[PDB]
Design a protein around this motif. Structure first.
Motif, PDB file in Angstrom:
ATOM      1  N   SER A 140      -2.127  -5.198  -6.802  1.00 35.20           N
ATOM      2  CA  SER A 140      -0.742  -5.549  -7.162  1.00 35.20           C
ATOM      3  C   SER A 140      -0.323  -5.032  -8.521  1.00 35.20           C
ATOM      4  CB  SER A 140      -0.507  -7.064  -7.167  1.00 35.20           C
ATOM      5  OG  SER A 140      -0.696  -7.840  -5.980  1.00 35.20           O
TER       6      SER A 140
ATOM      7  N   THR B  45      -2.294 -12.490  -3.609  1.00 38.07           N
ATOM      8  CA  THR B  45      -1.440 -11.953  -2.537  1.00 38.07           C
ATOM      9  C   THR B  45      -1.786 -12.379  -1.075  1.00 38.07           C
ATOM     10  OG1 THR B  45      -1.086 -10.054  -4.061  1.00 38.07           O
ATOM     11  CG2 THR B  45      -0.547  -9.604  -1.660  1.00 38.07           C
TER      12      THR B  45
ATOM     13  N   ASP C   3       1.339  -3.667  -0.241  1.00 39.09           N
ATOM     14  CA  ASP C   3       0.324  -4.270  -1.072  1.00 39.09           C
ATOM     15  C   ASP C   3      -0.218  -5.436  -0.328  1.00 39.09           C
ATOM     16  OD1 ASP C   3      -1.091  -5.532  -3.253  1.00 39.09           O
ATOM     17  OD2 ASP C   3       0.797  -6.415  -3.884  1.00 39.09           O
ATOM     18  N   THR C   4      -1.515  -5.505  -0.108  1.00 38.01           N
ATOM     19  CA  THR C   4      -2.039  -6.660   0.567  1.00 38.01           C
ATOM     20  C   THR C   4      -3.242  -7.196  -0.145  1.00 38.01           C
ATOM     21  OG1 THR C   4      -3.232  -5.148   1.797  1.00 38.01           O
ATOM     22  CG2 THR C   4      -1.081  -5.850   2.782  1.00 38.01           C
TER      23      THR C   4
HETATM   24 MG    MG Z   1      -2.310  -8.739  -5.392  1.00 42.74          MG
END
Ligand code: MG
Ligand code: GTP
Ligand code: GTP
Ligand code: MG
Lengths: 166, 166
Positions: free
Chosen positions: A17, A35, A57-58
């Motif tokens: 992230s 996340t 983004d994971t």
């Molecule tokens: Mg993240």
């Protein structure tokens, strides 16, 4: 409009992230905050071509078991991230390249190994062994920094180009 | 020390010497002044590895006939440069990829197509047709600027990495 569907995968703590936010927002996220799933869409110009980065983004652990699979089918290109001061984070890069080949039903997918956090000097994962895993897979290895922004546009663009020549 | 022997080839006017000087010296060369042969050696660190860039900025016309061949045998990796506002400069990129394969006796050499001068708006060579020549050769296409420095470390590093995975 040409577009590219980038999934950023890899372990917890690594800086998934803080790279996606550095590129789409130009500031560092010092703040601790994990996340589930996150889409950033930016209009960019890469080598004079207009494109849309549609990044997802994971994560790397949760109840994202093989629930990971749904996003991997549709991601055109993957950023695999490890942290250079975290031996374990580097070792689980396998676990992610094996199911990105399982859900993609191909041994060749456009990817990038990313040895993140490269400004800290408690490295534990040498550059030599991460540049050797990367040419074992037939893939790039780029070293990046989200505190500094060095390496960020390099990583993301190297990947986009890899998607162009597939 | 790991080292890499980069030859920068391509036509006259394009910006071969203004990229090599931007990278090794961090300033733009507005001044008109042509080349015969020039070695720049810098100690650099690329993806945390210590290396020596041993660049050989050269030319594109003179009594460098196939006297070009001596340097091409020994260059590990080639930067092929065209200027985006010069149709002819783009068309002679063939003439250079054919004798880099002739003296190297291989169809696969680590290379980069470089559409230089990308800050001028009298483009004549679209990005679309230079990104199509580049995947016709199985090679990268990076767009650069020596007035601005955008594209310079990208070009030179993309090439170094290409030499790592050969
Ligand atoms: Mg993240
Ligand atoms: N010094 C340093 N710290 C970094 C870097 N990028 C991220 N961090 C720090 O590492 C921690 C985690 O950053 P995130 O960007 O939240 O990482 P993540 O991989 O997304 O973690 P999850 O989403 O929970 O899976 C934060 O405390 C960041 O401030 C980097 O390049 N260097
Ligand atoms: N605006 C612009 N001009 C450039 C760029 N790079 C070089 N030039 C200009 O283009 C001209 C030629 O630059 P050089 O760097 O000397 O090019 P060269 O290919 O080495 O030419 P020779 O060595 O004679 O074969 C100079 O007038 C530079 O100021 C660029 O990125 N943009
Ligand atoms: Mg010159």
């Amino acid at each position: 409009m040409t577009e590219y569907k980038l999934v950023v995968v890899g372990a917890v703590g690594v800086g998934k992230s803080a790279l996606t936010i550095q590129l789409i927002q130009n500031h560092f996220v010092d703040e601790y905050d994990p996340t589930i799933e996150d889409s950033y869409r930016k209009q960019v110009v890469i080598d004079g071509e207009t494109c849309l980065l549609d990044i997802l983004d994971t994560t790397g652990q949760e109840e994202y078991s093989a629930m990971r699979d749904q996003y991997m089918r549709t991601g055109e290109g993957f950023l695999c991230v490890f942290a250079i001061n975290n031996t374990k984070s580097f070792e689980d890069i396998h676990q992610y390249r094996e199911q990105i080949k399982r859900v993609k039903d191909s041994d060749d997918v456009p990817m990038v190994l990313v040895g993140n956090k490269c400004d800290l000097a408690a490295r534990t994962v040498e550059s030599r062994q991460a540049q050797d895993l990367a040419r074992s897979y037939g893939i790039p290895y780029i070293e990046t920094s989200a505190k500094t922004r060095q390496g960020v546009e390099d990583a993301f663009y190297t990947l986009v180009r890899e998607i162009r020549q597939h």
